[PDB]
Amino acid sequence: MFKKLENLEKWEPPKDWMVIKTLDTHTAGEPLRIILSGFPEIPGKTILEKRRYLMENLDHLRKALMWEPRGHADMYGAIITEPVSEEADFGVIFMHNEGYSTMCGHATIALGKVAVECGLVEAKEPITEIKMDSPAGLIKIYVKVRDGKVEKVYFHNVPSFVLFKDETINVPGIGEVKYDLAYGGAFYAFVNAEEIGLKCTPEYYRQLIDVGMKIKRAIMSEKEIRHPFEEDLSFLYGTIFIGEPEDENSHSRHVCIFADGEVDRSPTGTGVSARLAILYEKGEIDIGEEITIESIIGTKFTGKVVEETRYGLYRAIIPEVGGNAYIVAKNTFLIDPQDPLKYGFFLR
């Protein structure tokens, strides 16, 4: 009835069930599942070491939390760790439907907001500075705070650069496709959506996943994607289709196809970083100039080239990306050891 629904609220699982609590957020529509407790401990003194440990020993738990039923193909996750570097407040490892990314813009925006609102760091007005160890390097977060509430979150990414420019690849099944490839904390191939007769709108959702994954795999089999200093960082994360903007002050539109067919519902925070590097080297924007990029569901990030730099032998920028995030849930996930899907399932 109404009253004995209380029995479901009082109900507790048996003691042999695994219990994993999370705090869930979304950033421009793109979720973040932040693990709080019940996870086994993750040894290592670098973020890359911690990330390497997860893939080899605990990946069934990534699938229990990322995949259906707990769970869905577009879920994203974050494990927050004690800081590795001397100046950091904390460290983070990201997880998605295929594995563990090297950096994540939308999660960083959410993490800065949760850090202020929920007490990972002390609040300062008007701006709180957070420094965060990520797999790609150190991230500086600037949290806008008025009267104890977060208003917008900005971050500075690791140096972002171009790796190739105006290439053509033959995508078996599609044909010839023109692309640029840049680094923004992760590696993306940038492709023009009308040039393959698709549009960056929901109407074309499954073709974007379909064509996007074809483009990604073709480039991966044919080209070396190299990070100047780190082995675990040297791979193609995704394909980003660039689209004509729908709204008035927006520069363009992003649809990021990443991991195993995953689609970013936000514009990509790492994608905006890599896109800023691309716009800068062909001179389409000036230092200090802020642009707005949208996503497939019409949500928006801001991006701006803060500074030139040198990264390895590459010409590079320090990008600033900004957005907002909201808390949407507190979850207690239950893993029944006799459950035939206790570690999830995923269909591609």
Instruction: Point out the residues that are catalytic.
Output: 104
CA-atom Rg of the chain in angstroms: 20
Smallest distance, Å, CB 286 to a copy of itself?
29
Q: Between 87 and 126, how does the x/- string for binding to a copy of itself read (CB under 8 A)? A: ---x-----------------------x--xxxx------
Q: Is the dihedral of CA 165, 166, 168, 173 positive or negative?
A: positive
Q: Contacting a copy of itself (CB under 8 A), which of 205, 288, 307, 308?
A: 205
Report the nearest approach of a copy of itself to the CB of residue 290 (Å): 19
Q: Does 348 bind a copy of itself (CB under 8 A)?
A: yes
Whether the Cβ atoms of residue 252 and residue 242 lie closer than 8 Å to each other? yes
- By the rule CB under 8 A, 202 interacts with a copy of itself: yes
Residue keyed to tokens 């649809």: 255
How many chain residues are in contact with a copy of itself, going by CB under 8 A?
66
Q: Does 1 bind a copy of itself (CB under 8 A)?
A: yes
Q: Of these, 53, 58, 59, 74, which contacts a copy of itself (CB under 8 A)?
A: 74
What number of H helices and E strands is found in the chain?
Answer: 6, 17
Does residue 330 bind a copy of itself (CB under 8 A)? yes
Decide if residue 83 touches a copy of itself (CB under 8 A). yes
Vertex 344: Cα angle to 265 and 219 (nearest 5): 50
Tell which residue, 346, 342, 345, 326, has the closest CA to residue 20.
342
- Smallest CA-to-CA distance from 327 within 147, 109, 126 is with 109
We find the least distance from the C-beta atom of residue 55 to a copy of itself, in angstroms, to be 20
Query: What region, left, alpha or beta, does residue 273 occupy, with left being phi > 0 and alpha being psi -120 to 50 degrees?
Result: alpha
Based on the shown chain and the rule CB under 8 A, indicate whether residue 127 belongs to the binding site for a copy of itself: no
Closest CB to a copy of itself among residues 1, 313: 1
Long-range contacts of 122-127 (CB under 8 A, 24+ apart): 123/148
**Contacting residue, 53, 226, 298, 306, with a copy of itself by CB under 8 A:** 298
- In Å, what is the CA distance from 315 to each residue of 80, 107, 159, 248? 32, 26, 9, 32
Task: Kindly tell me the burial class for residue 225, based on how many C-beta atoms sit within 10 Å of its own C-beta (0-12, 13-18, 19 or more).
Answer: middle
- When the beta carbons of 118 and 287 are compared against a copy of itself, the nearer one is 118
Interatomic CA distance for residues 43 and 151, integer angstroms: 35
Under the criterion CB under 8 A, does residue 82 sit at the interface with a copy of itself? yes
- Tokens at 312, concatenated: 């390895």
- Minimum CB separation of residue 118 from a copy of itself in Å reads 4
Residues 25-54 vs a copy of itself: string with x where CB under 8 A? -x--xxx--x-xx-----------------
Q: Which stretches of the chain bind a copy of itself, using CB under 8 A?
A: 1-2, 4-5, 7-11, 13, 21, 23-24, 26, 29-31, 34, 36-37, 68-74, 80-83, 90, 114, 117-120, 202, 205-206, 261, 263, 265, 296-299, 326-336, 338-342, 345, 347-348
